[PDB]
RNA sequence: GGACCUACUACGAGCGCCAUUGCACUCCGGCGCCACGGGGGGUCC
RNA sequence: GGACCUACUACGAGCGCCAUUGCACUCCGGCGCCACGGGGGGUCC
């Protein structure tokens, strides 16, 4: 149950800056977001981390937006293995 | 109200968002329902918060209205209707895109 | 008519039991907001009718927008705003339960 | 991943009774054609999930096509084609 | 088998809490409470 | 400083292909094509 949530199976064809703002459009409803980091690197291409201020927010986001088709690709959300700053 | 058009009219959108972000962010959510032709956005920030999403088939518009209704988009739940008939083009020609 | 918080649904599948129908309607209309009651007409002359009563008018409007003509039990339901004060007058006269 | 006769639904509202869910799904998916069975298990492994078995794949295709992401009991369902065939389907074909 | 009872028992049903996003078609996650129902026990017809 | 050009250079921005389902919080997978932009290089008013 980390604050940060780990999203993968994202549409890799989307630019990093566009993707960041597109994710904020959906996850802003759940609470205060601090940052959304997206690497378009080979190691972390279809992936993103969304950091919520409260754990209630991250839980509600994982609860609700699981399997949501994002750019026609359904997102796979997990709790992050490690805690964020 | 309206009849099943292939275009849907979205309003009650967050006016604080730039036009470029909104067009692209709407595509992120509504692309799942089918092929999108255009995404038109009210060009007046004073009275913005409106948008048109033009689908190829009416099936896409219908399914989109059912599912994404009341969806919190930028923490504001959007209000989706069927667009009036051939009205998506009227505002495009008249310059509100 | 005028935007009521209650919506009047008719053209319902008559073969369906009252208990199943109420619960199946709740399955679809819960997304639009909080539902107070779901009234179903147990009359033979005035059969195939139902009332879904919402807390907020915003909920009923989105429901009419989206679920209009929705094939429910293979029969497309036809939604209108309830005529003002009809639901209660129906709940009193027992025609709806 | 390929047009199966059954569709696999998950992200269902777990609080709903098995028979209510079975009947509520039939209320929605009967429009697409004749349904053979709707399998529902409220067990830890298979809860929040359902299988809808159609006679024709055309019905199943239209069902995934139309009702995808549809909020059912305020929870939007996520529809897939089933991986395997259903046992009732298998006998028709024999496998 | 009816009617009032009970220093007993959560078995059904019914509420909530936690956990689970899981591809099945040989039951079956874990708690807390419990209207009505069972099981035991007692007093009459 | 304007106008047309380059046996040159993919530095941006923009397209596609193959491969990858990967848990981060300094950084970088491989090709092919390139509108419009820069860098270098010329002929002119
Ligand atoms: S009843 C009695 C019925 C009567 N004994 C009979 O056989 O017809 C018992 C009541 O006590 C409650 N009860 C059941 N099990 C219980 C337990 N383990 N502890 C406390 N109360 C219980 C139930 O709610 C039920 O209404
Ligand atoms: S003006 C320069 C033009 O040369 C083209 N260009 C830039 N680099 C190039 C290269 N390495 N090889 C061939 N053409 C190039 C650009 O498309 C630009 O429009
Ligand atoms: Cu007893
Ligand atoms: Cu140059």
Convert chain B into a string of H (helix), E (strand) and C (coil): CCCCCCEEEEECCCCCCCHHHHHHHHHHHHHHHCCEEEEEECCCCCCCCEEEEEECCHHHHHHHHHHCCCCEECCEECEEEECCCCHHHHHHHCCCC
Q: A43: exposed, middle or buried (C-beta count within 10 Å: 0-12, 13-18, 19+)? A: exposed
**Resolution limit in angstroms?**
3.1
**Does the CB of A6 fall within 7 Å of any strand F atom?**
yes
How many angstroms separate the alpha carbon of residue D44 from the centre of ligand 1? 29
Q: How many CB atoms lie within 10 A of CB C17?
A: 11
For residue B68, the distance in angstroms to the closest alpha carbon of chain A comes to 11
How many residues in total does chain A contain? 85
Chain C interface includes D73 (CB < 8 A): yes
Identity of the residue in D23, D31, D74 whose CB atom sits nearest the CB atom of C71: D31
Q: Which residue of C has its CA nearest to B79?
A: C62
How many residues in total does chain B contain? 97
Note whether B67 contacts D66, CB cutoff 8 Å.
no
**How many Cα neighbours within 13 Å face the side chain of C9?**
30
Nucleotide with the nearest C1' to A67 CA: E21
Q: Which residue of D has its CA nearest to A70?
A: D69
Element (H, E) at C2: none
CA distance B81 to B11: 9
Give SS3 for D78.
Answer: strand
Q: A61: exposed, middle or buried (C-beta count within 10 Å: 0-12, 13-18, 19+)? A: buried
- Dihedral sign of CA atoms B96, B38, A10, B82 in order: positive
| Strand E nucleotides within a 7 Å radius of protein CB atoms | 14, 19-29
- Least Cα distance to D55 among D28, D86, D27, D79 occurs for D86
CA–centroid distance for B69 within its chain: 11
CA distance D43 to D60: 25
User: Which residues surround strand E, with CB < 7 Å?
Assistant: A 1, 63, 66-67; D 6, 8, 10-12, 14, 17, 39, 41-49, 51, 75, 78, 80-88, 90
Nucleotide with the nearest C1' to D78 CA: E21
CA of C30 to C1' of E34 (A): 28
Identity of the residue in B4, B70, B82 whose CB atom sits nearest the CB atom of C32: B70
Mutate which: B70, B72, B78, vs C, most C CBs within 10 A? B70
What one-character-per-residue DSSP string does A1-49 give? --SEEEEES--TTS-HHHHHHHHHHHHGGGS-EEEEE---SSTTTTEEE
CA distance C27 to C23: 6
Neighbours of chain B (3+ CB pairs under 8 A): A, C, D
- The answer to whether residues B31 and B58 touch, using CB atoms and an 8 Å cutoff, is no
CA distance A44 to C94: 63
Each domain of chain B, given as residue ranges in start order, spans: 1-97
Give SS3 for C47.
Answer: coil
CA distance D3 to D81: 6
- The answer to whether residues D73 and D16 touch, using CB atoms and an 8 Å cutoff, is yes
HEC readout, D25-74: HHHHHHHHCCEEEEEECCCCCCCCCEEEEECCHHHHHHHHHHHCCCEECC
Letter string b/e over residues D35-61, b meaning 16 or more CB atoms within 10 A of that residue's CB = bebbbbeeeeeeebbbbbbbeeeebbb
**Does the CB of A83 fall within 7 Å of any strand F atom?**
yes
Neighbours of chain A (3+ CB pairs under 8 A): B, D
Identity of the residue in A21, A29, A72 whose CB atom sits nearest the CB atom of B25: A21
CA distance C24 to C9: 13
Per-residue CA distances from D64 to A44, A73, D59, D91 (Å) = 31, 15, 9, 24
CA of A38 to C1' of F32 (A): 27
How many angstroms separate the alpha carbon of residue A15 from the centre of ligand 4? 29
E-state strands within C1-96: 6-10, 35-40, 49-54, 71-72, 75-76, 78-81
CA closest to E19 C1', residue = D44
């Amino acid at each position: 149950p980390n604050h940060t949530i780990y999203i993968n199976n994202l549409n890799e064809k989307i630019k990093k800056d566009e993707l960041k703002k597109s994710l904020y459009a959906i996850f802003s409803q759940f609470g205060q977001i601090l940052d959304i980091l997206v690497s378009r690197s080979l190691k972390m291409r279809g992936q993103a981390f969304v950091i919520f201020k409260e754990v209630s927010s991250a839980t509600n986001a994982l609860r609700s937006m699981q399997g949501f088709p994002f750019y026609d690709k359904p997102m796979r959300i997990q709790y992050a293995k490690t805690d964020s700053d």
